[PDB]
Amino acid sequence: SLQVFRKMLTPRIELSVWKDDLTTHAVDAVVNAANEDLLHGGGLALALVKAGGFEIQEESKQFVARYGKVSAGEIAVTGAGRLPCKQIIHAVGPRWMEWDKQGCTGKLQRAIVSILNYVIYKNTHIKTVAIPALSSGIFQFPLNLCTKTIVETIRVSLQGKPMMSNLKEIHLVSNEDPTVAAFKAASEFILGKSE
């Protein structure tokens, strides 16, 4: 693990950027990059199941059998199996479509807003959450726009705004150096100098 950026968005909430493996990253809730069927067949999703256990996949299928497919911009929550976290927030980011960049950006923004609402107002026992560069890998969302949308959505949602929450830390995390650099640059341009 390595923290490369940190800043107080509010007096209580810190945003940080990390180089780390999300399967070894200790937080209350890890955000998975899922598809609408919650079938964890590649990428981060597959890693989380391999690290945390097949029960994650089992519960994911149970979720979909009860509530249907998760739309882009929406979330489903399961147990974390044997991951170093207490819950997995399965966020469905959009597949990138050059033909609808605004649409895709909107769904990404919507995913981040759902995550924030979840950890702030819904499950109030979450102190720390880790979010990847949703949609950037298999879903081909350009890394610069991805990380900027995430960081800008968080700032507009919370920066300067004293919330009454148990939320203390939002980690933007990747085990890949280009993504870590992109999160850091995005953070410095949108939030200013690291503390």
β-pairing verdict for 14-19 and 2-8: antiparallel
The helix or strand, by DSSP H or E, that contains position 90, with its residue range, turns out to be strand 87-92
Technique behind the model = X-ray
The helix or strand, by DSSP H or E, that contains position 46, with its residue range, turns out to be helix 43-52
Domains of the chain, earliest start first:
2-191 (3.40.220.10)
CA distance 147 to 149: 6
Q: Which two tokens stand for residue 182?
A: 């992109």
CA distance 183 to 38: 26
CA distance 29 to 117: 13
Q: Which two tokens stand for residue 171?
A: 């980690």
Resolution (A): 1.9
Q: What is the dihedral of CA 131, 16, 159, 108, to 10 degrees?
A: -20
CA distance 60 to 39: 8
Residue 87 bridge partners (DSSP): 29, 79
The helix or strand, by DSSP H or E, that contains position 110, with its residue range, turns out to be helix 101-117
Please answer whether residues 80 and 94 qualify as being in contact, where contact means their C-beta atoms are separated by less than 8 angstroms.
no
Please answer whether residues 46 and 27 qualify as being in contact, where contact means their C-beta atoms are separated by less than 8 angstroms.
no
